Amino acid sequence: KIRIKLRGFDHKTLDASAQKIVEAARRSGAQVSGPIPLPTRVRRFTVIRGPFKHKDSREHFELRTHNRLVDIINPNRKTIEQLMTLDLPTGVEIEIKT
Amino acid sequence: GNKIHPIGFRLGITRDWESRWYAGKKQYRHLLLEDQRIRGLLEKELYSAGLARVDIERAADNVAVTVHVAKPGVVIGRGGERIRVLREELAKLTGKNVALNVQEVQNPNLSAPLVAQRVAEQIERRFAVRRAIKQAVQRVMESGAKGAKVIVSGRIGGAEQARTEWAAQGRVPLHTLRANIDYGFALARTTYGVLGVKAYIFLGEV
Amino acid sequence: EQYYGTGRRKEAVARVFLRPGNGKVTVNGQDFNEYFQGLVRAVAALEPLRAVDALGHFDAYITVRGGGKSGQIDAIKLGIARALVQYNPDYRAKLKPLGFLTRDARVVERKKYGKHKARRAPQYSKR
Amino acid sequence: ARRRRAEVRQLQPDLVYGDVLVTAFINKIMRDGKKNLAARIFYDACKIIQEKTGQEPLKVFKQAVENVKPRMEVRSRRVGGANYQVPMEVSPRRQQSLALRWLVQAANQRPERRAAVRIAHELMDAAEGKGGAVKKKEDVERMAEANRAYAHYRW
Amino acid sequence: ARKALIEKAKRTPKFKVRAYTRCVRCGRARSVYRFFGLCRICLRELAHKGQLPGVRKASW
Amino acid sequence: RAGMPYVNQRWLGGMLTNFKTISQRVHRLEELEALFASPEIEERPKKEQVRLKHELERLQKYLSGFRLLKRLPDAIFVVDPTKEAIAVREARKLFIPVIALADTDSDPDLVDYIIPGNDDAIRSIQLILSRAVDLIIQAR
RNA sequence: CGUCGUCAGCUCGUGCCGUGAGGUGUUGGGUUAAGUCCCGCAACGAGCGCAACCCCCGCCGUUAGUUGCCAGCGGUUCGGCCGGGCACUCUAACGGGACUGCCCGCGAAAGCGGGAGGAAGGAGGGGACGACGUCUGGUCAGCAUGGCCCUUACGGCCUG
Numbered sequence A: 001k002i003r004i005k006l007r008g009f010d011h012k013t014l015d016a017s018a019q020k021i022v023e024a025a026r027r028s029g030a031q032v033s034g035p036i037p038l039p040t041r042v043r044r045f046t047v048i049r050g051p052f053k054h055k056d057s058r059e060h061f062e063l064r065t066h067n068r069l070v071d072i073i074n075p076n077r078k079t080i081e082q083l084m085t086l087d088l089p090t091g092v093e094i095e096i097k098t
Numbered sequence B: 001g002n003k004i005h006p007i008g009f010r011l012g013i014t015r016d017w018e019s020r021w022y023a024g025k026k027q028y029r030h031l032l033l034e035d036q037r038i039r040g041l042l043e044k045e046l047y048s049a050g051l052a053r054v055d056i057e058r059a060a061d062n063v064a065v066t067v068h069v070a071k072p073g074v075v076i077g078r079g080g081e082r083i084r085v086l087r088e089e090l091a092k093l094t095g096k097n098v099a100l101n102v103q104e105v106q107n108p109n110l111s112a113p114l115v116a117q118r119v120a121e122q123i124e125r126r127f128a129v130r131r132a133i134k135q136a137v138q139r140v141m142e143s144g145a146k147g148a149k150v151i152v153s154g155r156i157g158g159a160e161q162a163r164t165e166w167a168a169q170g171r172v173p174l175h176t177l178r179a180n181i182d183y184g185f186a187l188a189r190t191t192y193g194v195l196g197v198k199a200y201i202f203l204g205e206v
Numbered sequence C: 001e002q003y004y005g006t007g008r009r010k011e012a013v014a015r016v017f018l019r020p021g022n023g024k025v026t027v028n029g030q031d032f033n034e035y036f037q038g039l040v041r042a043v044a045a046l047e048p049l050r051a052v053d054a055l056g057h058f059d060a061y062i063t064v065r066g067g068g069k070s071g072q073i074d075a076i077k078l079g080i081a082r083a084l085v086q087y088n089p090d091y092r093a094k095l096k097p098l099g100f101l102t103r104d105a106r107v108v109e110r111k112k113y114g115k116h117k118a119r120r121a122p123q124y125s126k127r
Numbered sequence D: 001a002r003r004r005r006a007e008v009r010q011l012q013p014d015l016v017y018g019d020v021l022v023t024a025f026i027n028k029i030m031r032d033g034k035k036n037l038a039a040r041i042f043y044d045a046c047k048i049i050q051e052k053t054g055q056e057p058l059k060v061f062k063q064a065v066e067n068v069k070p071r072m073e074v075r076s077r078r079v080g081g082a083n084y085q086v087p088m089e090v091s092p093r094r095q096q097s098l099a100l101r102w103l104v105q106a107a108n109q110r111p112e113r114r115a116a117v118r119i120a121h122e123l124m125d126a127a128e129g130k131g132g133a134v135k136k137k138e139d140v141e142r143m144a145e146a147n148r149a150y151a152h153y154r155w
Numbered sequence E: 001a002r003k004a005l006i007e008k009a010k011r012t013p014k015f016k017v018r019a020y021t022r023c024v025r026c027g028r029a030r031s032v033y034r035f036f037g038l039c040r041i042c043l044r045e046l047a048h049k050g051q052l053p054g055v056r057k058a059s060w
Numbered sequence F: 001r002a003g004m005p006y007v008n009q010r011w012l013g014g015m016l017t018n019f020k021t022i023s024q025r026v027h028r029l030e031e032l033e034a035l036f037a038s039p040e041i042e043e044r045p046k047k048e049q050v051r052l053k054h055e056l057e058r059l060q061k062y063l064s065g066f067r068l069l070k071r072l073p074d075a076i077f078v079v080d081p082t083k084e085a086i087a088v089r090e091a092r093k094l095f096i097p098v099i100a101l102a103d104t105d106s107d108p109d110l111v112d113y114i115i116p117g118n119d120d121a122i123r124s125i126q127l128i129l130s131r132a133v134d135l136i137i138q139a140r
Numbered sequence G: 001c002g003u004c005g006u007c008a009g010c011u012c013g014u015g016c017c018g019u020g021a022g023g024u025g026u027u028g029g030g031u032u033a034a035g036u037c038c039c040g041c042a043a044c045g046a047g048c049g050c051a052a053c054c055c056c057c058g059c060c061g062u063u064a065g066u067u068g069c070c071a072g073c074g075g076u077u078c079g080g081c082c083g084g085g086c087a088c089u090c091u092a093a094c095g096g097g098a099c100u101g102c103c104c105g106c107g108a109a110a111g112c113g114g115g116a117g118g119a120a121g122g123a124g125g126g127g128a129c130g131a132c133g134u135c136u137g138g139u140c141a142g143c144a145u146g147g148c149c150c151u152u153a154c155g156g157c158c159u160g
């Protein structure tokens, strides 16, 4: 009945962090839902390469955010207290829901 | 011509972002702006030290600045006075209690920014450009470095007309992704204008 | 009892289940003659059935999603072919030559910068 | 093309009649990508033909197809900055292509208000041996073997 | 990008619809982006440097 | 049927005068054939492996037998000193003795030790070479 | 940054030929999208380029099942709405698969024409990727910048 929402730019570190979250939570007794991949959100920026003119240059950039979900069921006192303690990587952002 | 930036080409693979933090649309711009301020301050301050790279990280209203320097002795000094006052200055810039770290680069001949900086210094010291480039390329190649290349922009030795000098040695495959090419640019401000020194170092594969 | 095939065509996806019976086909809780009304090519979707002289035994339950009508038609065709191959594995010996087991892979080309639409270039005159 | 020889696209046979040439004609009628509308026009015309002409519409349609099949085209050759109309023998591929085309323009050139009626009338007339399409084909034919003098420029 | 103009757009211009946005790096007023606060040129430059986290060259 | 090297595909221009440049090719061949028999080839996707296989095939085809030369040879054996004129000239330039199975259409002067006989007629080649190889084997 | 131009070119090391500048390679035949390969040949290799390494789409596996999904069953206000499952579609990670690899003929070989098999067959479709250089090419009005000039106006506010 607790939801773990993970966001980040780099998917390697996000996947890694989700792995530790789910593993540690599993070791503390009750059932784990499992890492749920949610659809990524992509922003596109199209900018003229040239600084003055040549409007047909058009370099493309993308900024993509990834999403995860963990959804721990039957929260133990140990499960919760051991959680909200593990330090996040440099990128990964976490949200706790009921 | 018009080659693209060899780093921006390989950001996903074989290179890593200098800045590693996440922020929503709400606070992205503010964090980036303060990041730019930090980078500018550290560029201005730690020039003589032999700076190569600045890394920024964020966890929770926390900043972990990491500075790559050829000579950390210059950075720290006696009893870590300079590093302490520098931490104080950075924290005064942004109320987030930044945690400054200093790393020494192994064999500073294998850092493209450093090579470009040194050659730019030599140009500003009115050295002969061609000899300087040749010596720099040879120096890099002696320290492993399966390939090296150095370019100087133009306006050589106060001559009226500008011209590119250019010198390479070994393999510099700019087209292959798994190349691990280190890139460094330095601007040399001289009495007769400005010169642009570029350095590519092909350091292994994959 | 049930034989299942997927099939895909140009952003359209189908799911087809084949069952024994009198051969009544239904699509998205409707009739194949109701969902595809007035579309001439619609019958083509059922071609892989009558190839094996089916359409008299197999009732089809189809749930289809995405793309435009023709997209669902081709998706249904490929799905039916796959389901039939599952039902009678030797059908592959005869369904393959008539071009039923191939998944047509031609999709929309992305628009390119400096061009109107992906191939067409802006007109210029007085060269 | 300077290397390849542009493999002819193999059309899909029609569903109603089980014919490829029918599909070619349907495609030739089609404009602005509306296939369903074009097929409706063709089938409407076919039923009108069946109404006004006893036998099968497919037979009449095919008959018209060969009745508007030329065998002698004129090709422009640039010799000494002058255009030479060399007679040539149109390949069966080109024969069918030109037949279907000319049939379509001839049909659409008619004064009848509705498209299906125009298609039916053109097909019927071309089957008979008269109309715009057959006239155009005859004109093209007679254009050749009239500049036979100009046929030594092989091109 | 006169220093005066840059220093002027940083206040409350007596009205809401008088204020506008400028590139925080070069003071350009033309083609800035809300998400970044940079003009197109600075955006390209910083994106190439690798100083924008999770911003990469797109190819779909 | 000896420790002796051989060249029977094509005499590359500079096998002897440009010996080091060919030793580079020998090193490349040995390192390639070591890599192919290595548990490191799980990388380099299939097309790269195909390219490497093609390269190794070519190297094995051309420099087979030449691999046994750790250094310059102390002699040479030529079947036809006119067909293999380049080899003979290279051997002359470096002060290497020349042995040839010369025939009517050859210049005897360029050959130090000469066997005036046939260069066609497989039987003639067989007899001469078999005798020479047997003498090599026995006198070891 | 544009452009020739994603055109296929630009060179170097050693060897060899020439008194020498220089040549060879890099020419010739075939083939290719390509200086891409094969053969011939005093050349044998290499570097920057082509290609490949990267991304998207096309087929299939696993790992995962919420906010996405509903084949079977039980509810059902007819709504996947409920309980259920997560099989299927899908979402997003990691791999597999295609390499003329396998048969038939042909060629000295590169390769060519057919044939299974396969989702895809000979570059599978698209993108990113732009050599030495050319254009006194474009931009002192993105930014930086040497020189010259104004500094009660060529600076800076305000209304129209």
Ligand SMILES: [Zn+2]
Residues within 6 Å of the ligand: E023, E024, E025, E026, E027, E028, E038, E039, E040, E041, E042, E043, G142
């Ligand atoms: Zn800017």
